[PDB]
Write a protein that binds this ligand. Structure first.
Ligand SMILES: [Zn+2]
Lengths: 21, 30
């Protein structure tokens, strides 16, 4: 999920947009 | 875009800004 991916490790802008509606 | 670990409220504001009018879903349940 998002924490593992963007908090626990680092997220590119693209990886963040996967969480938009 | 910043290249860092984004946690807690910092993750949510990142989402807010990136998603704009689309909105987003925050489900931290791991
Ligand atoms: Zn802080």
């Amino acid at each position: 999920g998002i924490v593992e991916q963007c908090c626990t490790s680092i997220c590119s802008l693209y990886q963040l947009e996967n969480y938009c509606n | 875009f910043v290249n860092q670990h984004l946690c807690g409220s910092h993750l949510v504001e990142a989402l807010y800004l990136v998603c704009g009018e689309r909105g987003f879903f925050y489900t931290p349940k791991t």
